[PDB]
Amino acid sequence: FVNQHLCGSHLVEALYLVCGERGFFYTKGIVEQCCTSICSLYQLENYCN
Amino acid sequence: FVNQHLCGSHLVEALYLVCGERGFFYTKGIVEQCCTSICSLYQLENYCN
């Protein structure tokens, strides 16, 4: 599960893009949620600060 | 500021690489510190949660 590491890298970019200036909180956590099936941008707005 | 937005993208990848499994909190306060001047990996490690 370098697979997990790789997914996590993309997830933080996606979080960055969705959340913008409010920023976000990153925990794996989230990755466990979003690396099995794709999380929508709508779903990602949920992890913004 | 398109420039900070671009820099922020690199900054969140760097934070992800350093913090890894610990995860982290991303805020404007880190962007202002590390996208005005370059932060070492040692410094970013201080923002890992």
Added chain:
Amino acid sequence: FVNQHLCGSHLVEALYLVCGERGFFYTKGIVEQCCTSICSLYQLENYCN
């Protein structure tokens, strides 16, 4: 621009995250808009086909 070439790299990534399977058209003109001032994800969905 040196700036536009790098900015374009980030822009195509944002377009991909936003448009997903719908896909998109990248045209150098999308860059003239979104690399001078920041385009929101909402704005970018407009370039999804």
Added chain:
Amino acid sequence: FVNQHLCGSHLVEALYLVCGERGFFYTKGIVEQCCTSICSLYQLENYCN
């Protein structure tokens, strides 16, 4: 269905690099071609505008 999404993220960067000033067209479909099997940079030029 994350492996494909992760791959698609890299493919658009490759397209960006190969096509340059020409721009390119991105489609589900191009990803199934180039994320099932590795496409050479030569192959990718086919997707440039």
Added chain:
Amino acid sequence: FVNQHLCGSHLVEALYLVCGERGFFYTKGIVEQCCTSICSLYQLENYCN
């Protein structure tokens, strides 16, 4: 194969960040190593110039 190819992309970004101005070296021998099991920042320092 595509996964290894993709993983290598993340590996060189990690090496760039870890090595900084020293620069770095990699081979498809090192990519195989750090993409089968995850390499620490410490292990990655081994590939700096």
Added chain:
Amino acid sequence: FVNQHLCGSHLVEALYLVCGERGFFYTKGIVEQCCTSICSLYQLENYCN
């Protein structure tokens, strides 16, 4: 210089896409060449192992 640092990140991505499995030696001289002026795909192949 933060812009040199950021450009360098994109350059390694490009070098990797071009060199793939062959690998490369990444040094200051290459960032000075390809981050002051844009390097073509042919120019990048010059740095592959």
